[PDB]
Amino acid sequence: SNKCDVVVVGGGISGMAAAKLLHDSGLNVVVLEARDRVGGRTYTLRNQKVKYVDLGGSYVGPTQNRILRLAKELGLETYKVNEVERLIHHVKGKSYPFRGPFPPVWNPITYLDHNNFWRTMDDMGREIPSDAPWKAPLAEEWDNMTMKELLDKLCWTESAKQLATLFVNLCVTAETHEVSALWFLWYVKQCGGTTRIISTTNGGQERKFVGGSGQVSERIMDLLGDRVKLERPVIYIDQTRENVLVETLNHEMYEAKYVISAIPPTLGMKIHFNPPLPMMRNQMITRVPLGSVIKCIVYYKEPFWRKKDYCGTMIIDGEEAPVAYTLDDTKPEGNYAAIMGFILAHKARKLARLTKEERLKKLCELYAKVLGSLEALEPVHYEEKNWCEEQYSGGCYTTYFPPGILTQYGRVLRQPVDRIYFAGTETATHWSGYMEGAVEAGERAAREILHAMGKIPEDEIWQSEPESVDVPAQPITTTFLERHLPSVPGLLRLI
Amino acid sequence: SNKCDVVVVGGGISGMAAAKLLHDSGLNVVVLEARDRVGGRTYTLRNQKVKYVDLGGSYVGPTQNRILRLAKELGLETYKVNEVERLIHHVKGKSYPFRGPFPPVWNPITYLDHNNFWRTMDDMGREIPSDAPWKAPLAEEWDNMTMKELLDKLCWTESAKQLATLFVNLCVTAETHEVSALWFLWYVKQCGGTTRIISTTNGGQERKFVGGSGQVSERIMDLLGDRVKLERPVIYIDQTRENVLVETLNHEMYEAKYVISAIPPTLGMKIHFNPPLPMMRNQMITRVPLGSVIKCIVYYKEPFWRKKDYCGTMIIDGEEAPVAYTLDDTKPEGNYAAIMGFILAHKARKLARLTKEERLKKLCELYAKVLGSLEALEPVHYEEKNWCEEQYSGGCYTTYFPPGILTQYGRVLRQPVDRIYFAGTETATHWSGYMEGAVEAGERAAREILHAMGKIPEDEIWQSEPESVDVPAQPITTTFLERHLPSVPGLLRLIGLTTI
Ligand SMILES: *Cc1cc2c(cc1C)nc1c(=O)[nH]c(=O)nc-1n2C[C@H](O)[C@H](O)[C@H](O)COP(=O)(O)OP(=O)(O)OC[C@H]1O[C@@H](n2cnc3c(N)ncnc32)[C@H](O)[C@@H]1O
Numbered sequence: 004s005n006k007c008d009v010v011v012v013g014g015g016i017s018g019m020a021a022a023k024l025l026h027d028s029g030l031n032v033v034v035l036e037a038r039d040r041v042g043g044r045t046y047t048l049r050n051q052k053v054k055y056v057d058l059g060g061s062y063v064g065p066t067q068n069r070i071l072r073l074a075k076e077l078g079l080e081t082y083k084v085n086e087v088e089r090l091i092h093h094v095k096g097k098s099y100p101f102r103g104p105f106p107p108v109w110n111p112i113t114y115l116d117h118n119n120f121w122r123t124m125d126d127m128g129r130e131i132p133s134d135a136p137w138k139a140p141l142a143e144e145w146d147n148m149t150m151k152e153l154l155d156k157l158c159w160t161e162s163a164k165q166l167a168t169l170f171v172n173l174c175v176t177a178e179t180h181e182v183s184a185l186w187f188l189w190y191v192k193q194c195g196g197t198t199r200i201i202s203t204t205n206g207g208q209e210r211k212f213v214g215g216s217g218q219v220s221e222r223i224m225d226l227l228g229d230r231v232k233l234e235r236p237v238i239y240i241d242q243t244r245e246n247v248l249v250e251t252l253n254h255e256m257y258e259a260k261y262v263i264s265a266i267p268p269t270l271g272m273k274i275h276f277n278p279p280l281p282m283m284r285n286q287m288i289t290r291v292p293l294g295s296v297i298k299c300i301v302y303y304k305e306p307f308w309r310k311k312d313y314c315g316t317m318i319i320d321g322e323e324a325p326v327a328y329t330l331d332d333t334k335p336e337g338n339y340a341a342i343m344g345f346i347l348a349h350k351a352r353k354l355a356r357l358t359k360e361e362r363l364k365k366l367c368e369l370y371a372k373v374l375g376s377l378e379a380l381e382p383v384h385y386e387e388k389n390w391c392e393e394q395y396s397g398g399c400y401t402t403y404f405p406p407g408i409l410t411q412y413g414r415v416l417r418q419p420v421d422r423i424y425f426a427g428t429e430t431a432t433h434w435s436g437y438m439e440g441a442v443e444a445g446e447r448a449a450r451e452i453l454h455a456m457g458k459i460p461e462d463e464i465w466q467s468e469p470e471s472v473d474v475p476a477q478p479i480t481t482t483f484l485e486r487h488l489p490s491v492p493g494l495l496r497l498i
Numbered sequence: 499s500n501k502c503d504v505v506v507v508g509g510g511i512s513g514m515a516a517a518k519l520l521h522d523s524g525l526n527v528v529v530l531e532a533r534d535r536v537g538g539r540t541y542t543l544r545n546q547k548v549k550y551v552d553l554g555g556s557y558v559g560p561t562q563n564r565i566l567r568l569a570k571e572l573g574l575e576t577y578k579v580n581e582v583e584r585l586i587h588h589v590k591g592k593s594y595p596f597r598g599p600f601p602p603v604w605n606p607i608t609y610l611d612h613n614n615f616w617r618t619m620d621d622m623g624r625e626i627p628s629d630a631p632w633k634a635p636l637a638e639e640w641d642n643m644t645m646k647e648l649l650d651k652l653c654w655t656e657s658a659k660q661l662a663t664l665f666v667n668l669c670v671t672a673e674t675h676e677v678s679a680l681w682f683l684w685y686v687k688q689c690g691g692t693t694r695i696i697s698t699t700n701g702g703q704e705r706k707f708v709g710g711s712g713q714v715s716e717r718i719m720d721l722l723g724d725r726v727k728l729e730r731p732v733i734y735i736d737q738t739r740e741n742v743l744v745e746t747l748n749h750e751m752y753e754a755k756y757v758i759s760a761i762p763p764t765l766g767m768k769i770h771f772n773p774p775l776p777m778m779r780n781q782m783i784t785r786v787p788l789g790s791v792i793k794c795i796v797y798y799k800e801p802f803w804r805k806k807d808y809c810g811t812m813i814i815d816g817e818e819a820p821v822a823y824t825l826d827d828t829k830p831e832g833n834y835a836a837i838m839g840f841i842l843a844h845k846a847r848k849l850a851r852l853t854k855e856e857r858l859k860k861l862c863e864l865y866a867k868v869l870g871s872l873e874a875l876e877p878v879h880y881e882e883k884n885w886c887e888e889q890y891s892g893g894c895y896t897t898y899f900p901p902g903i904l905t906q907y908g909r910v911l912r913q914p915v916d917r918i919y920f921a922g923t924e925t926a927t928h929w930s931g932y933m934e935g936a937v938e939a940g941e942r943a944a945r946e947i948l949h950a951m952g953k954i955p956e957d958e959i960w961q962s963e964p965e966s967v968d969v970p971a972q973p974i975t976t977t978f979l980e981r982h983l984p985s986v987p988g989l990l991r992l993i994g995l996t997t998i
C-alpha cells in the first residue's frame with residue numbers, strides 16, 4: 004500500500020483546502036479524486052469561443068473571506084458581476100425594470116405582503132443557531148413543515164408567493180414542497196440573511212474569479228503534485244486495524260492515520276465501510292439529496308442589453324419560462340458578451356429531454372421577450388452543464404434536507420467516525436452550500452485532525468477569518484417602515 | 499472472469515425468486531450477495547431459547563398469492579397469528595378492548611371522523627393506478643403535500659388524527675411529515691386498501707411461516723447450490739462492452755449477458771457505474787430512503803394475556819410509548835410465548851441510544867400497563883433487531899418517498915438501464931414493500947430478460963397469479979352507513995343548509 008499521514012477523499016475545493024492546510028503543516032497527504040479532473044462542483048471550461056467559463060460554482064462576495072483569502076494566496080483576482088444598469092423583473096408577460104436588490108411592488112396590499120415575507124424569513128432565522136439549527140426553539144415545528152406549507156401560510160398574495168417560490172428554487176435548486184422550512188431558514192440565515200444571499204452588489208453574487216473558479220482546485224493540485232491521484236474513486240474504507248485502509252476502484256490501497264471525507268454527504272453511500280457506519284450516519288446518507296440545475300451560458304457579439312440600460316439580471320416568474328434567473332456573464336473587458344441563466348429544480352428534469360440546440364432556442368426566445376430585443380435571437384455560441392447527470396456530484400448547488408431530516412440526523416453530519424473526519428461545504432456553518440463553506444469545512448476538518456494528533460489545542464479547531472481588504476462587506480440595513488409596517492393579517496387585525 | 503447468462507445482485511427473496519425462475523428456464527445464473535447469508539430484510543434467528551424467530555419480514559396473508567405459492571413449492575407451511583381473543587387500543591393512558599380490525603369509537607362526531615378518514619384513504623386510492631401512481635389526476639397536488647398535511651386537512655378530531663398517525667408510522671416506519679401523501683395513498687391502495695393492510699384475520703398479518711421466513715431464501719439457495727456467492731458485495735457494473743462486467747468487493751469479476759439489480763433502490767449508490775447512470779436514475783437513488791424500525795420480541799413462560807381474553811394485539815397511541823403495535827408471537831404449538839412489538843420511525847432513532855436491557859425494561863413496563871398484568875414484568879428471554887444499522891438494507895420495512903419525488907422520479911424505478919433490469923420489492927405493483935412484492939418483482943424482472951432474449955413474448959412479462967387454495971381471500975366489504983355517513987364538514991354543511 005501507499006502510506007501517508009492523511010487521505011483526503013475528494014479533490015473539490017473542500018478536500019483541496021484541507022489537503023493544502025495539512026501539507027503546509029508538514030504532513031504527508033494524498034488526495035483521492037474519482038474524476039479525471041479536480042474541482043468537483045466547480046468546473047471551468049476553456050476554449051477560443053468563451054476564453055473561459057464557469058459551468059459550476061462561480062460567484063463570490065463580501066463576507067466570504069475564506070475563499071477570497073485562499074484564492075488570493077493562489078494568485079487569483081476577482082472582477083465584479085455587471086450590475087451598473089437596471090435589473091428586470093418579468094411578471095405576467097411584461098418586464099419591469101428596477102434598481103436595488105429586492106424586486107419592488109406598487110399595490111399597497113402586495114407591498115405589505117412582500118415586505119412581511121422577506122422580513123419574516125430573517126426574523127425566523129434569528130432563532131436558528133448557525134452551528135446547530137436543530138437547537139432552534141421551534142426546530143421540530145419548523146422541520147416538520149415544507150417551505151411550500153410555510154409560504155402558503157405566510158403569503159396572502161400570489162405575487163409574494165410566486166416571488167418567494169422563485170427565491171427558494173434559485174437558492175437551493177429544489178421545489179418548495181421538497182425542502183424543510185427549518186433547513187431552508189437555516190440556509191438563508193447562515194449566508195447572512197435575505198439581503199446578503201440575494202444581492203449581487205454587496206452580496207453573494209458580487210464577483211467572479213478572473214480565469215474561472217476551477218483555478219482554486221487546479222492551483223492547489225499544482226502545489227501538491229503527484230499527491231493528487233485522479234481517477235481514484237474510493238470504494239472501501241477499513242478502520243478495523245492500526246492504520247486506516249482506503250481502497251480505490253482501480254485497485255490501489257492507501258494507508259493513513261486519518262481520513263477526511265470531502266464529498267457530498269450522500270456520496271458516502273458509494274463507499275463500503277468496515278466496520279459498518281454507526282446507525283445514524285448509515286441512514287443519514289440516504290436522506291440528503293442534492294438539488295437539480297442546468298447552468299446555461301448564451302454568448303452574443305455585444306452586451307446589447309446595456310444599451311437599453313439593463314444590466315442583464317432577469318428575474319422571471321412563472322412555470323412557462325425555462326430560466327427563472329439570469330446574470331450578465333460578460334468578461335470584465337466588455338468582451339465575450341454573455342447571459343448566464345439557471346434552469347432550476349423540476350425544469351431541469353423536464354427540459355433535460357430536449358437537445359442542446361432546442362434549449363438554446365428556448366432560452367434565446369425567452370431572453371428576446373424579457374430584454375425586449377431581437378439581438379437575443381442571434382447567439383454566437385452556447386455552453387451548458389446539467390449537474391443532475393454527475394455520478395460524483397449527485398446534483399448542484401448543494402444538499403437539501405427534506406422535512407423531518409435535519410432535526411433527526413443533522414447532528415450526524417460532521418461527527419467524526421473513529422478516524423474519519425468530515426469536510427465538504429455541507430458541513431460548514433457560514434455559507435454552507437458555497438465555495439466559501441467548502442473552504443471553512445476543509446480547513447476545520449484538517450484542524451480537527453491536527454488536534455487529534457496533539458499538534459494544536461481544541462480552541463484552534465474553529466478559526467475566525469479576517470475581512471478581505473479587496474471585497475469588504477458593507478452593512479445590511481433596513482428602513483423604519485420595512486421594520487414596522489404590518490403584515491396583511493396584521494392590517495386585517497387592526498380592521 | 500466467471501461467465502454466466504444473468505448475474506443477480508442481491509440474495510433477498512426478490513433476487514432468489516428471479517434466480518430460481520431463470521435457473522428453472524434453463525439459464526446459467528449467479529447470485530452475488532453482500533452478506534454472509536441470504537434473505538436480506540428477512541432473517542430467521544435460531545437458538546435454543548426461541549427455537550426460531552423472524553427478526554425481519556414475517557407476515558403473509560390473503561391476496562399475497564405469489565409468496566404463498568413460492569413458499570408452498572419449497573415445502574413450507576403457514577400458521578395463523580393469534581387473534582382469538584380481544585385486541586387492545588390503548589389511548590390516553592387506558593386500554594379499550596375490541597374486536598374487528600378497526601379500533602372503534604363511541605362519540606358520534608368522532609365516529610363520523612374515523613369513518614370518513616378510512617373511507618377517504620380508499621377513495622383517494624381508487625384514483626391512483628397501481629402501476630403508475632404519477633398518472634393519478636391530482637398526482638402533483640397529492641405528491642406535493644406530506645401525509646401530515648393531508649391528515650391535518652382530513653381529521654376533524656384529534657382521536658382520528660392520532661390513530662391515522664399511528665397507521666402511517668406502522669405501515670411505512672416513517673413520520674407523517676416525512677412521506678408524500680401520493681406515495682402513501684398508492685402504498686395502501688396497492689396492498690388492497692385500508693382494511694386489507696391493517697387486518698390480521700383476512701389481511702396482511704394473518705399468518706407466519708412455520709420455522710421462519712428465512713427458509714424461503716435458504717431453500718432457494720439449496721436449489722441453486724454454488725451459484726449463490728455469499729460475501730460478494732457488488733461495487734462496479736460496466737456495460738461498455740459486449741458482455742456486462744460485474745465486480746465485487748472481494749476482488750472477483752463476473753461476466754453476464756444481463757444483470758438483475760435486486761437491492762433496495764438507494765443501495766444502487768454503493769455501485770459505481772460505467773457508463774454513468776442516466777440523469778433521472780442517478781438522482782432518484784439519492785431521494786428514496788428506507789424507514790426506521792426496531793423489531794423486539796419479549797418471551798414469557800406462558801401466553802398469560804390470553805387468560806384475560808386479550809389476543810396479544812396492542813395498538814398504543816402517542817409519544818411516551820416506545821412500542822405502538824404488538825402481535826402475539828407464540829408458536830402455533832402454544833409454547834415459546836412471546837409478544838412481538840415494533841419501535842417505529844423517530845422512536846427507533848431515539849431509543850437506539852439505550853442498551854438492550856433498558857429497552858427490554860421499558861417494553862415490559864409498557865406491556866404491564868397496557869395488559870393490566872404484573873406478569874408482563876417477568877420476561878424469560880428477549881431478542882431484537884434495529885434495521886437502521888444495516889449497511890446492506892438501509893432500514894425497514896421498505897423505501898418511502900418524500901414529497902415531490904414519486905411524480906418526478908417514479909417512472910424510472912423499474913426502467914431498464916441498458917442490460918440492467920430492476921427487481922426488489924420496491925418495484926412491485928401489488929404488495930410492494932412486502933415479501934409478496936419481492937416475488938412479483940423478481941419474477942417480472944427475470945421474465946423481462948427472458949423476453950429480451952426472445953424466449954417469451956411481451957405479454958408473458960407480467961403474469962397473473964392463481965389464488966392460494968390454502969389462504970383464500972374474503973372480499974373487502976362496506977356497509978351502507980360506512981359508505982354514506984357524512985364527514986364532519988359534511989355534517990356541518992347539512993346543519994347550515996337546514997337552518998336557512
Ligand atoms: C454545480 C453548481 C454549484 C454552485 C453554483 C452553480 C452550480 C451549477 N453556483 C455557485 C456559486 O456561484 N458560488 C458558490 O460559491 N458556489 C456555487 N455552487 C456550489 C459550489 O460549487 C460548491 O458549494 C462547492 O464547489 C462544493 O465543494 P466541495 O469540495 O464541498 O464538494 P465538491 O466540489 O462536490 O467536491 C467533491 C469531490 O469529491 C469527488 N468524489 C466524489 N465521490 C468520490 C469518491 N467515492 N472517491 C473519490 N472522490 C470522490 C468528486 O468528484 C469531487 O471532485
Ligand SMILES: *Cc1cc2c(cc1C)nc1c(=O)[nH]c(=O)nc-1n2C[C@H](O)[C@H](O)[C@H](O)COP(=O)(O)OP(=O)(O)OC[C@H]1O[C@@H](n2cnc3c(N)ncnc32)[C@H](O)[C@@H]1O
Pocket residue numbers: 507508509510511512513530531532533535536537538539540553554555556557558730731732733760761762765768769791792793885890891893894895896921922923924931932933934936
Ligand atoms: C426489516 C423488516 C421487513 C419487513 C417487516 C419487518 C421488518 C422488521 N415485516 C414484514 C412482514 O411482516 N411481511 C412482509 O411481507 N414484509 C415485511 N417486511 C418487508 C420485507 O422483509 C421486505 O419487503 C423483503 O424481504 C424485501 O425483499 P427484497 O429481496 O426486495 O430486498 P432485500 O431483502 O433487502 O434483499 C436485498 C439483498 O441484497 C443484498 N445487497 C445489498 N447491496 C448489495 C450489493 N451491493 N451487492 C450484493 N448484494 C447486495 C442484501 O444483503 C440483501 O440480501
Ligand SMILES: O=C(Nc1cccc(Cl)c1)c1coc2ccccc2c1=O
Pocket residue numbers: 062104105106166167169170173174175200201202207208318328
Ligand atoms: O436568491 C438569489 N437571488 C435572487 C435575486 C433577486 C431576487 C430573488 Cl427572489 C432572488 C440567489 C440565490 O442563490 C444563488 C446561488 C448561486 C447563484 C446565484 C444565486 C442567487 O442569485
Ligand SMILES: O=C(Nc1cccc(Cl)c1)c1coc2ccccc2c1=O
Pocket residue numbers: 557599600601661662664665668669670695696697702703813823895
Ligand atoms: O397498519 C397496520 N396495522 C394496523 C392495525 C390496527 C390498527 C392500525 Cl391503525 C394499523 C399494519 C401495517 O403494515 C404492517 C407491516 C408489517 C407488519 C405489520 C403491519 C401492520 O400491522
